[PDB]
Design a protein around this ligand. Structure first.
Ligand SMILES: O=C(c1nccs1)N1CC[C@@H](Nc2nccc(-n3cc(C4CC4)nc3-c3ccccc3)n2)C1
Length: 779
């Protein structure tokens, strides 16, 4: 294919003229029409020369015609002549393409292969991101940004290049842009006077991100100069407001270092930060003084420095992010004994009694600590995690205390249990058929199966020591709080995932998909499963050895109600096997077939379901990459399951490989300058459009993969005349924002912006995950 093409090569030193004409062709090209004159040049210099071209076979080469004329016979008969300036095999730069059609020559080509093309974009992109990220770490204003936030604003960087003698900023102008010099040298002028010279790693415009004031200097490139630039406009979309995020981060970091506020939820600490009174004080100023302090119980320093005293005795100096008042937060009726005096102009966060009660959900701090440390534990457990907040709150207040002494059988192997236990204090031994399995301690849990099943306990639980306290809830209370569908779900899920299964215990009933997916019965238990069989030989032959390892890893650790649950894997001489739950509600496509165009409530249900599944994967740094209705089943209750984890990757910085279904692939995948979890939120938009409008919004009626990609890249997004709902159109437009930086869901707040969109105003996210909503369709 390409082997033939290499014969035609010749080493031709590109003159000034040639680095011009190649620049034109690529600038007027689907994939290259948004690359800097720096990247177009780097690509331009990688172009091989060819003396002398294609047929109908697999091809990797993109050509820019130099010298002669080239006839393009489309169906084995002349279609059109092409001459100096023209290009062809555009598709080759995207993906391994079945060629457009044969192209003989009449009477020089510039050339490059896909592998070399994608690799150059990759190396350029990674190099540029890593440089910008290191530079952002040298800008002190961004110090209190989280790692995640720093990576987000790195994407916001725009490269700018400046000819010698070209103004970067003018004194008096109202710029909202910060510049970091990547290469070259600028002169700083103030009132037309030469002050100093900026160099590589220099930066200015910090104030321009925070205030709306005029430039204090004119800065002019002395030699050719490249800058990284952040605009306040883009920073605001990505972060919301820089100063607010910095002060919130300072406060939440401090609360996470406190031995009192440590043990509280991430939501509660964000409430405290967001609700805290923030005040400026002058220098050498008494802020808090002994008896004369009222409702203030805790302070965090945001700026400057204060000195803590107890009567006359200096205890220490608090600077940024340091805090005081644990004993006052614990004992809010005890008198304030300490003094706090500013050592300089400072900014302090004050947390009051009212702020503590409003955020920690109780007048009584020790009740709040007790509530949360019970909540933390069950919230990490599958069976409690997806209960509504009402159901959760009922379960937590149902917990009572009991005590045990060294050697006491808390549970006895063989007995019918009714109780779930959490360890308040002490250590217990778990013993199954006389063999110690493990020791459990403070905050560990046991016995949960008694909630779902009337069965013999499988192990004893024996108190290891005296003075052992457990919280307990009886199943009668759990069974009152829970409702039919969720209980059926848990009873079905836990039984089938914990059954020990051997290959000899399985028989096949029918083939489901075709390697092959079989419907299998476990003979001893009569439980049904799906079994995916992948050919060992087929995997070795497609160098997919590393990829199947990574599929098992991802499929294994998935534990979400709206994602397929793996039971275990098998292997023999010929196959790898996946044993999963059997999903029996058919395909999502069966549902939209029967239903037609979805109403707002049916669309809310299916998109919202998918959003919760995708949010779960992103939280564990997985990008799904193949989101489409085809890849979603329904269970017997009408709730969804994501099934196909072939395209899924753990995210190690930036991904670059082209994977997925062309109609659903995000522009940033196609353009090859790198992508992350964002691509799944683009696909979310393609899915919603299908749901409401009916057809796909891009390349709906196109056979040619290339014309699909063009429509995704440049096509006008329109709606049919029967789609008028402002909130539906707005959510779809924002999801199909081509630039991932300004796409909805893709900023600091993540999926919160999608969940809180007006499209979902009447939509109960708790009731969805809790299986309390009526689905669009059942069975
Ligand atoms: O609705 C039904 C049925 N109704 C009554 C009896 S069976 N089915 C829908 C598809 C089948 N259920 C199912 N459950 C889980 C996974 C799979 N499944 C299907 C596919 C097709 C090939 C793409 N792939 C899987 C699968 C199975 C195991 C691991 C990974 C994926 N199928 C049966």
């Amino acid at each position: 294919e390409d082997s033939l093409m290499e014969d035609h090569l010749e080493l031709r030193e590109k003159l000034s003229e040639d680095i011009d004409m190649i620049k034109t062709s690529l600038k007027n090209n689907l994939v290259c029409s948004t690359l800097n004159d720096n990247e177009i040049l780097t690509l331009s210099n990688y172009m091989q020369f060819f003396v002398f071209i294609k047929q109908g076979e697999k091809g990797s080469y993109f050509f820019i015609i130099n010298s002669g004329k080239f006839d393009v016979y489309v169906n084995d008969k002349k279609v059109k002549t092409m001459g100096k300036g023209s290009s062809f095999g555009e598709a080759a730069l995207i993906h391994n393409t079945q060629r457009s059609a044969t192209i003989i020559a009449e009477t020089t080509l510039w050339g490059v292969q896909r592998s070399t093309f994608r690799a150059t974009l990759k190396q350029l992109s990674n190099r540029n991101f890593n440089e910008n990220r290191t530079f952002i770490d040298s800008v002190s204003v961004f110090d209190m940004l989280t790692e995640a936030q720093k990576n987000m604003i790195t994407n916001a960087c725009v490269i700018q290049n400046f000819k010698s003698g070209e103004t970067i900023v003018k004194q008096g102008d109202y710029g909202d842009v910060l510049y970091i010099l990547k290469e070259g040298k600028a002169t700083v002028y103030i009132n037309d006077e030469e002050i100093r010279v900026l160099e590589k790693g220099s930066y200015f415009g910090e104030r321009a991100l925070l205030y709306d004031e005029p430039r204090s200097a004119t800065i002019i490139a002395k030699e050719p100069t490249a800058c990284a630039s952040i605009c306040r406009k883009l920073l605001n979309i990505v972060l919301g407001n820089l100063q607010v995020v910095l002060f919130r981060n300072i406060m939440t970091e401090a609360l996470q270092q406190s031995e009192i506020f440590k043990q509280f939820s991430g939501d509660q600490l964000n409430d405290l930060a967001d609700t805290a009174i923030v005040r400026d004080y002058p220098a050498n100023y008494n802020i808090l003084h002994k008896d004369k302090v009222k409702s203030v119980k805790y302070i965090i320093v945001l700026e400057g420095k204060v000195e803590l005293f107890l009567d006359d005795t200096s205890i220490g100096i608090l600077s940024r992010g340091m805090s005081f008042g644990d004993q006052y937060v614990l004992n809010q009726k005890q008198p304030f004994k300490h003094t706090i005096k500013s050592l300089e102009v400072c900014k302090i966060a004050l947390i009051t009694e009212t702020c503590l009660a409003d955020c920690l959900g109780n007048n009584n701090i020790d009740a709040s600590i007790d509530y949360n440390n019970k909540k933390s534990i069950i919230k990490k457990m599958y069976i409690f995690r997806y209960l509504t907040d009402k159901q959760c709150n009922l379960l937590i207040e149902a917990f009572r205390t009991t005590r045990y002494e060294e050697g006491d059988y808390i549970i006895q192997e063989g007995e019918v249990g009714s109780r779930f236990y959490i360890i308040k204090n002490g250590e217990v031994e778990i013993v199954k058929n006389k063999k110690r399995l493990r020791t459990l301690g403070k905050n560990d849990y046991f016995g949960e199966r008694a909630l779902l099943y009337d069965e013999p306990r499988t192990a004893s639980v024996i108190s290891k020591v005296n003075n052992v306290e457990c919280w307990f809830v009886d199943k009668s209370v759990f069974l009152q709080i829970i409702q039919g569908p969720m209980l059926a779900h848990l009873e079905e899920r836990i039984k089938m995932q914990d059954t020990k299964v051997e290959m000899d215990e399985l028989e096949t009933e029918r083939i489901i998909g075709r390697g092959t997916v079989k419907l299998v019965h476990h003979k001893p238990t009569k439980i049904r499963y799906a079994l995916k069989c992948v050919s060992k030989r087929s995997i070795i032959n497609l160098n997919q050895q590393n990829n199947i390892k990574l599929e098992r890893e991802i499929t294994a650790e998935n534990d979400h109600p709206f994602i397929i649950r793996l039971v275990r894997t098998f292997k023999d001489s010929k196959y790898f096997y996946f044993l999963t739950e059997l999903v029996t509600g058919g395909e999502l496509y069966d549902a939209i077939r029967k239903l037609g165009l979805l109403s707002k409530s049916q669309a809310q249900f299916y998109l919202g379901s998918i959003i919760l599944a995708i949010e779960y994967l992103h939280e564990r740094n997985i990008v799904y990459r193949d989101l489409k209705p085809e890849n979603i089943l329904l269970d017997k209750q009408g709730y969804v399951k994501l099934i196909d984890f072939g395209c899924a990757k753990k995210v190690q910085g930036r991904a670059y490989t082209l994977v997925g279904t062309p109609h659903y692939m995000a522009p940033e995948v196609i353009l090859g300058k790198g992508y992350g979890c964002t691509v799944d939120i683009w696909a979310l938009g393609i899915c919603l459009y299908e749901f409401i409008c009916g057809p796909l919004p891009f390349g709906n009626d196109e056979e040619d993969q290339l014309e699909i990609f063009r429509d995704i890249l440049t096509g006008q997004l329109t709606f049919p005349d029967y789609v008028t709902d402002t909130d539906s159109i707005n959510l779809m437009k924002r999801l199909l924002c081509r630039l991932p930086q300004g796409r909805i869901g893709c900023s600091i707040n993540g999926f919160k912006d999608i969940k809180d969109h007006p499209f979902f105003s009447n939509f109960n996210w708790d009731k969805l995950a809790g299986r309390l909503l009526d689905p669009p369709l059942v069975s």
